[PDB]
Nucleic acid binder design. Structure first.
Ligand code: NA
Ligand code: NA
Ligand SMILES: [Zn+2]
Length: 327
DNA sequence: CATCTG
DNA sequence: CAGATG
């Protein structure tokens, strides 16, 4: 957790690069486990040979760990941190809609910066275009004080459209966080479930309402169950307009809400622990459900949930206020 | 994993 | 349809 921090960090830089700049997914996976294993390792890696001893750790990485241990830096890491091509890609990538793939194409075309992009708006697609247009807003965290205003609006409109709607704002906003990255809304309706054959209007209606009142500003992607978009709290009395925020809305069959709502609320760690305890308590838990575990190895069959309460009980645990769902 | 692009 | 991105 700190006894091998550098090692792990360097490794992570290395991995990332293989993957983003080069195409080196193997290499890239290579850096990854190594860090993971070294990450657990209980001692102070005093040498490469010592690390090598570990699995995941081979010859080349040992080499690297040596040079790093020996001199506060790495040549390769050095050479990578400079290189404009490499940094270009790490940069373009910040735009919402550019993955490495695209970052590489663009750079080869010579777009390596914000303006470059602007000049080449033709070459960008709708998601990318929006990303570019709100590059700044997009990097801005979301203060909970804004989040509350947000949630306030969303929930009121969802209600007006259909009393039977059930909306929840997951994320850390939920676990109490002071600020957040984007707004995740979990959505469901009684008339929609596991078997019930679809209902696209179910989602399309609200999205529509939201736009109606101008809360939603643009659409990133709009499917029958998942909607990726942009919203914005109406600027009060002109002088201060808000940033544009990322927002997601997703339809869930009522029969697996709370597992979702559970899950999406995190944190990753709380999940894992809850996950592991359920397994003890003779169960299985996933994004959508909780099933009893047969001894034959495994075994199915969806238990029935009506609240995040039904779930805990099952695995026989203390209800966890979201605030304390941390780890 | 769901959506888009081309 | 494969392949990209979130
Ligand atoms: Na990106
Ligand atoms: Na292939
Ligand atoms: Zn030791």
């Amino acid at each position: 957790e700190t006894l091998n921090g550098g090692i792990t960090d360097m490794l992570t830089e290395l991995a990332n690069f293989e993957k983003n700049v080069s195409q080196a997914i193997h290499k890239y996976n290579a850096y990854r486990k190594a860090a993971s294993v070294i990450a657990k390792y209980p001692h102070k890696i005093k040498s490469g040979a010592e690390a090598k001893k570990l699995p995941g750790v081979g010859t080349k990485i040992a080499e690297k760990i040596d040079e790093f241990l020996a001199t506060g830096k790495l040549r390769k890491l050095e050479k990578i941190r400079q290189d404009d091509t490499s940094s270009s890609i790490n940069f373009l990538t910040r735009v919402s809609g550019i993955g490495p793939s695209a970052a590489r194409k663009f750079v080869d075309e010579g777009i390596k910066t914000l303006e470059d992009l602007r000049k080449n708006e033709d070459k960008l697609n709708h998601h990318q275009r929006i990303g570019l247009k709100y590059f700044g807003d997009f990097e801005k965290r979301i203060p909970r004080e804004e989040m509350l205003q947000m949630q306030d609006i969303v929930l009121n409109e969802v209600k007006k459209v259909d009393s039977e709607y059930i909306a929840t704002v997951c994320g850390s906003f939920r676990r109490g966080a002071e600020s957040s990255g984007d707004m995740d809304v979990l959505l469901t309706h009684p008339s929609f479930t596991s078997e019930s054959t679809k209902q696209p209007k179910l989602l399309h209606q609200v999205v529509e309402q939201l736009q109606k009142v101008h809360f939603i500003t643009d659409t990133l992607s709009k499917g029958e169950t998942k909607f990726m978009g942009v919203c914005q709290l109406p600027s009060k009395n002109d002088e201060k307009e808000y940033p544009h925020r990322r927002i997601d809305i997703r339809l869930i069959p009522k029969d697996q809400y709370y597992c979702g709502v559970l899950y999406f609320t995190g944190s990753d760690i709380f999940n894992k622990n809850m996950r592991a305890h359920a397994l003890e308590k003779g169960f299985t838990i996933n994004e959508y459900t909780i099933r009893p575990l047969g001894v034959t190895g495994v075994a199915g069959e969806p238990l029935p949930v009506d609240s995040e309460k039904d779930i805990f009980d099952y695995i026989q645990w203390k209800y966890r206020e979201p605030k304390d769902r941390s780890e």
